């Protein structure tokens, strides 16, 4: 009677999350410790935990699934732990060192403010390509493509022969301004291919113009090396992960998450886009619901055990960071933009010895939770320990009770580490920390929306993650959101979002079109031609990716795009082309109008200064089974008595209060819960203090009010 159709995974967070959903939108969320040395184990265990809540076995469910998506640390750890091939590098003679120099910035990427200024904490990771596997060719092309120093091909043959003699398992080629004029770089590419053929050895060649033709040599060269360093090894890892499921019943090809928020095959030609590990799925999930619910402006809030992540969906679209840094590497990958606010509910709480100020993080207990877990060994209190003291969390229901927690351990550790030093009671100390955390998150949401030129009233707030529903009341209080939403599957929303993502390949190329306000048609005719030619080069890449996955062009839905701005001023939006192709001066006028329209919709305009195109975009989408959103008829306002599961005292605003406990899954659409109550699940807790109310809709989404 039950048909499990879609599977979503997110192993990048505190642990391995799995999200299963059936033909009706009924769901379960699985949780199990991650096993990065062999991620298959944790993926199986997590799936078995989730399906157990349905009374189902893994063996029975996998045979039903018709699609599944994975996101995690497979690619990330392969880069961080430097377990890739012996890839070589060919650059411009005289600049062989610019890769391993890391542009200086890679000595302090991912550092908290205090570590960034604390010089001695700075540290270089080993270069992806060592010096002895780097060579140079004599050539220079300037910023507009003029060949200042023509390519000296004899230096390319020698470079290629040098790396082949060093038994290079890959050869990357990156010359300056090849994104502008790829003539020389692609000539070096061909010369390398020839000398490889002669040698009889199997050595793939990667030209940065063919893979990531964008400005910034450091970003671009890193991103192309990943294709020759970690791509094929990552394919092996993802083969085992997908083989583990396949040899257990799955009849589909697994897809994986990409930086740009779309899913791609794990056999893709470009797999550097799978280095993403953060919960960008959560942003894709909220957008997917907004599309169906009618919410254009959404503030996403993922409060997990290891991170506090936030993001905005403004007018249906989400922001893409184009020159991000990941794994302490500057990269040329379009990434869904999220901001980290902290180190999760496992964030350690300390008193600075010199100041006695309260410090959260930046390190986190993570899966170890806190001191309340005696067998974890954690000796330092965490935000979760404050939830134990204050009574928000059920000691006997952490992961259904799998984790043996002792609330008295939290009371004792907070008393010696925080409360007594400050002269406070244990409850006031814990409540105070939670108060500090709520203000940080509340202000960071307010400021973020204010930055886009909006007020929270124009927005809706989504609160998910295992610990999101624990703080929703606190960091949404008084902001005046149109609606505050807690999904019933909050503990696996990031995994739900991976399954909601499109099967979407994306390719980018840099441009430098400069157009005054008024110009003759010929000039407009050449601008459209430049953009059109870029679209044509990217369309090839997109359709080739799908052709390898077994999909034909007439099955792919292409959406051309470009990044445009009023000259001199930058923007954080990308425009979908109203036209599949641009040729005439009128077609160009449509593209400039599309930006003016999008700019006014999201946000002040300045058509006077002209327009600049800095990049072209091509996206190709193929329809795939997506998680069904429940749409059940709503029942009575009063929750069933079977949902009441006792009372627990929790502490808020200097008051101990008897709170009604509820079994989340037992509640029904239409039910209303009046605080003080705690709606409990096996892997998430939804706190509703007095002065707050909640109701559940047909989609199993909770709505939070202040009454």
């Amino acid at each position: 009677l039950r048909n499990v159709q879609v599977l979503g995974i997110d192993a990048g967070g505190t642990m391995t999350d799995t999200f299963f959903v059936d033909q009706d939108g009924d769901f379960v969320v699985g949780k199990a410790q991650s096993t990065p040395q062999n991620e298959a184990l944790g993926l199986i265990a997590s799936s078995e935990d989730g399906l157990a809540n349905w009374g189902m076995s893994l063996h029975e469910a996998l045979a039903q699934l018709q699609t599944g998506v994975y996101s995690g640390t497979a690619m990330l750890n392969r880069v961080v732990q430097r377990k890739g091939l012996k890839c070589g590098l060919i650059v411009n003679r005289g600049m062989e060192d610019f890769h391993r120099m890391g542009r200086a910035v890679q000595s302090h990427l991912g550092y908290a403010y205090e570590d960034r200024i604390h010089l001695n904490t700075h540290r270089y990771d080993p270069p992806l390509v060592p010096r002895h596997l780097t060579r140079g060719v004599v050539e220079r092309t300037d910023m507009i493509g003029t060949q200042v120093i023509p390519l000296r091909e004899d230096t390319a043959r020698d470079a290629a022969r040098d790396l082949i003699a060093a038994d290079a398992e890959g050869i990357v080629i990156s010359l300056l301004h090849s994104y502008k004029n790829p003539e020389n770089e692609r000539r070096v590419r061909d010369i390398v291919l020839e000398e490889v053929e002669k040698s009889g050895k199997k050595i793939p060649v990667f030209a940065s113009a063919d893979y990531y033709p964008v400005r910034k040599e450091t970003h671009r060269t890193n991103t192309t090396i990943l294709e020759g360093y970690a791509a094929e090894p990552s394919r092996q890892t993802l083969s085992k992960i997908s083989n583990a499921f396949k040899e257990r019943g799955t009849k589909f090809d697994f897809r994986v998450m990409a930086t740009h928020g779309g899913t791609i095959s794990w056999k893709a030609k470009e797999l550097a886009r799978t280095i993403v590990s953060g919960p960008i799925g959560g942003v894709i999930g909220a957008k997917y619901l907004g599309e169906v619910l009618g919410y254009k402006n959404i503030a996403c809030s993922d409060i997990g055990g290891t991170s506090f992540d936030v993001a905005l969906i403004t007018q249906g679209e989400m922001t893409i960071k184009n020159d991000p840094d990941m794994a302490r590497l500057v990269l040329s990958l379009p990434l869904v933009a999220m901001d980290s606010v902290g180190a999760g509910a496992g964030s350690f709480i300390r008193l600075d010895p010199y100041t006695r100020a309260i410090k959260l993080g930046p390190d986190s207990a993570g899966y170890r939770v806190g001191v309340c877990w005696k067998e974890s060994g954690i000796e330092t209190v965490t935000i979760s320990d404050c939830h134990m003291v204050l009574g928000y969390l059920n000691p006997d229901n952490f992961l259904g009770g799998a984790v043996k927690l002792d609330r008295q351990r939290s009371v004792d550790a907070i008393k010696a580490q925080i409360a007594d030093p400050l002269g406070l009671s244990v409850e006031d100390a814990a409540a105070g920390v939670i108060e500090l955390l709520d203000s940080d998150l509340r202000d960071y949401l307010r400021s973020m929306i204010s930055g886009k030129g909006y007020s929270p009233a124009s927005f809706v707030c989504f609160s998910y993650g295992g610990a999101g529903p624990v703080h929703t009341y606190g960091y949404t209080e008084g902001l005046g959101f149109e609606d505050v939403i807690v999904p019933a599957w909050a503990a696996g929303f990031s995994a739900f979002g991976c399954a909601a993502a499109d099967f979407e390949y994306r390719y980018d190329k840099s441009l430098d079109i400069n157009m005054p306000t008024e110009t003759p048609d010929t000039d407009k005719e050449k601008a459209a031609a430049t953009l059109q030619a870029a679209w044509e080069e990217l369309t090839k890449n997109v359709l080739e990716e799908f052709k390898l996955n077994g999909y034909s062009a007439d099955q792919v839905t292409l959406q051309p795009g470009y990044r445009m701005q009023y000259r001199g001023q930058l923007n954080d939006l990308e425009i979908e082309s109203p036209l599949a192709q641009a040729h005439t001066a009128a077609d160009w006028d449509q593209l400039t109008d599309a930006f003016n329209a999008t700019y006014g919709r999201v946000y002040a305009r300045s058509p006077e200064l002209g327009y600049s195109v800095t990049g072209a975009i091509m996206r190709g989408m193929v329809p795939i089974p997506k998680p069904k959103i429940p749409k059940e008829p709503e029942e009575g306002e009063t929750p069933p008595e079977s949902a009441k599961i006792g009372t627990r005292k929790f502490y808020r605003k200097k008051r101990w209060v008897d709170a009604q406990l509820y079994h989340m899954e037992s509640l029904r659409p239409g039910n209303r819960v009046m605080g003080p109550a705690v709606i409990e699940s096996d892997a998430t807790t939804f706190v509703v203090p007095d002065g707050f109310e909640t109701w559940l809709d047909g989609h199993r989404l909770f709505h939070l009010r202040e009454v």
């Binding site: 908290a112 205090e114 570590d115 604390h118 001695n120 904490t121 540290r123 600075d352 010895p353 010199y354």
Partner: protein, 167 residues
Amino acid sequence: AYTRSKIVDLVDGKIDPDTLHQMLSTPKDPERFVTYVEILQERMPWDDKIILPLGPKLFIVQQKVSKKWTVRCECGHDFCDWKDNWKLSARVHVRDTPQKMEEIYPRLMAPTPSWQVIREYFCPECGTLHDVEAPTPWYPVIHDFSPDIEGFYQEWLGLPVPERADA
């Protein structure tokens, strides 16, 4: 506090990255000095008590017999009283010519001896290099460090001051 082996790795320069980052970003351990000195003590070929390390191989030591405090090289050579400047009782080699300068720097990258001179202060017995000054000509020998050992031991560490005799 940190494991003794971690502090040992620190001294030997073999510590791992994650621990070294901890030591830097986390609050200092008040127990570092006591452990640090003891680690250095068991590595000396003499049992004279270290009371303040001045360098990788230079220490202020309590002489086990006279109870005087002297600056001592790791090999055992005593320079002077702890209040005096050990350099004044050492051996020096001054690079005041382009010839000498180009033995440690490439030309053009080397300082100019008429502006800056390099002084190398050695231990007379083992020839260890304990300090290198780079002043202008004529410049006095620097007395780099005059520590307040009594206040350090007594007020900051809460430890008893070692027995001291006058020189």
